[PDB]
Structures are given as C-alpha cells and as structure tokens.
C-alpha cells in the first residue's frame, strides 16, 4: 500500500498531538466511515482530504516550530496519495456530506484543542481511507 508512507509520516507527529485523560470524545465518528462507504463516499473522502490539507494541517504547523516540517511532510504525503487516485483509477469517480459538515462544525467548536484532536485522529483517518479503498 502507499498508505505505509502516510502512516510512517504520521508516526512522526503522533506523540506531539496526542492528548491525555480526555473522555475520548471521538471527532472522526462511525457516521463518517459510513459516509465514506456510501453512495456519496467519493465526495466525503475528497472533502475530508481537502479539509485536512487546507484547514487542519496549516494550523497544525503553527503549534510549534519543531513539529512544522513533520506536519508539512505528512501533508505532502497526503497530497501524493490524493494525486495517486485523483488521477488514475475508479477510486475518485467524483469531481454533499452531512457527516463531514458535522466534523467541521465540531472541529470549529473545539478551536485550538480541535487542531490537536484532528491531528491525533489522523491514524483513524487513514484507516477510514483504507476502509474506503478496500471496498473497490
């Protein structure tokens, strides 16, 4: 898989964004994975990649000068994974998602704690992406 590269890059930022004794309120819920696997799955996934690339990661990079390059590295890897599909097979037949909107609104309400929460759940994100592809 080309996900190993993405998972490698994420292992490098995992520790930084991981947070303690929080009542583990999951941001990337089952509904999102359900959306990824449904009729508008392609659109939900493309929107989530866009959201991470344009709204999450650039904010994540500014949390600490020492984590910046590694966040940017993860971003490049995500952009690559994108192109890989975005310009090839049936993995992105599309050019909305209730679940995704819910994620953005929850993220917004969490503000900066939201940046850390979204980054720490990136492994869950890759898993949902994997779940998506393992279904085509």
């Amino acid at each position, epitope marked *: 898989n080309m996900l190993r590269d993405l998972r490698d890059a994420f292992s490098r930022v995992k520790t930084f964004f991981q947070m303690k004794d929080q009542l583990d309120n999951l941001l990337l819920k089952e509904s999102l994975l359900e959306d990824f696997k449904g009729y508008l799955g392609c659109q939900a996934l493309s929107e989530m990649i866009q959201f991470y690339l344009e709204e999450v990661m650039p904010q994540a*990079e*500014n949390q600490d000068p020492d984590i910046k390059a590694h966040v940017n590295s993860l971003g490049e890897n995500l952009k690559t994974l994108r192109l890989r599909l975005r310009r090839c097979h049936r993995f992105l037949p599309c050019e909305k998602s209730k679940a995704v909107e819910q994620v953005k609104n929850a993220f917004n*309400k969490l*503000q900066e*704690k939201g*940046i850390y929460k979204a980054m720490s759940e990136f492994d869950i994100f890759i898993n949902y992406i994997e779940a998506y592809m393992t279904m085509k």
Partner: antibody
Amino acid sequence: QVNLLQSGAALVKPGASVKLSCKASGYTFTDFYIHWVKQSHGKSLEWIGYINPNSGYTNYNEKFKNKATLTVDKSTSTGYMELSRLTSEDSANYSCTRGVPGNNWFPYWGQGTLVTVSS
Amino acid sequence: DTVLTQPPALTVSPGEKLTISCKASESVTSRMHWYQQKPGQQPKLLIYKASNLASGVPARFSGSGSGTDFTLTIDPVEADDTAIYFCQQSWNGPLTFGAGTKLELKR
C-alpha cells in the same frame, strides 16, 4: 508594513443590513486568517469569527451565526463582514484582525469601523 | 463557552509591582493571551500563550500560568500604563475575552 484598512463609519437604519470591508496590505493575503471582533460602548470585546482567505472556510461564534456573514475577495486582498437585520444592539465598533492560522490571538488590528443603528 | 474572570478594577502606584489575575471556567492549557487598550486606541497584544512577550512590548510586562489560572505582571508599573487590560483564550471555541481590568495609577 502590515496594515488592515477598514471602510468608513456607517449610520444605518434598524432592519437594514450593512457590509463592512477590511483591505489588507504588507503581507501575503492568503497566508493569514481574517477575524472580526465587536466592542460595544462599555468596552467588552467579543469574537465574531474568522475566514481563511485561501479557501473561504469560516468559523463563526455561535452567538453571531444569524447576524454576521464573512466573505473574502482573494483578488483584491479584501475581507468583508455583512451584518443583517440591524437593531440597536448591533451598534458598536467592529474591527478586523489578522491571525496566523492556528494561533487565534491578535498582534495586528484594523483601525475599527463604528456602526450606528438608528432611524 | 469558556468564561474568563478578571477583576474589574485595580489601583497601584508608579514604581510598584502590579499583578492581574484571570481565571478560566475550564482549562485552556497554555492558550491565554493579554491585551492593553488605552483610551481612544485599538487593543495591543502584550503577552501570548501565557508567558511570551509580544515583539515591541517592554520587558516590564510578563505573564505566567497554565490550565485555569493566569497572571499578567507589570513590574515596575508607570503612569502611562493606565488602561484597560483584557485576557483572552483560544483553546476552546468560541474565542472569548475577560471583561477587562481597568488600571488606575495612584498619585
């Protein structure tokens, strides 16, 4: 050389809307977010929300979601905030500020625009 | 939403040490910032992320704290420091500000 130039004071009638602007200069416009803040006479500061100029993505304070609409014109490095259904409660000094993405604190402020809602 | 509680008013003399407390209703980790607003002026950032001095701000200003309890310290304070000081948090949405602490200089 960073500068946020706001549009002029506005005397507007109850029930109408008004659109404020914030012209940015001195930096790469798409590298920073534009936030809007409200300060009513009496001085309490309230955050309205932000807009990421690169994408148009917004984050609104729930308290202003039915009152304010943020937009940007990437091509002219200008941010806008439209206030609708004006009441006397909306009379205040509104300011735009520049934020490093992910660092919601404000080193740079526009000069402020005073909105007076009256017949 | 996170409520920030700061004293409404404080009086101190030039040359002395002044501390302003700001308490949040829930943790904001290190994301507490401070502004100085003089009459007729827009707010000016003094301290960011609890203890970092904003560029251009004199070293007489410092801050400390994490979690729910923070303090802005001006040492020594001087006559033109009369103004209103605001604390603001960015850890939780929406961003919120304290009600402001008006600083009076005794003479």
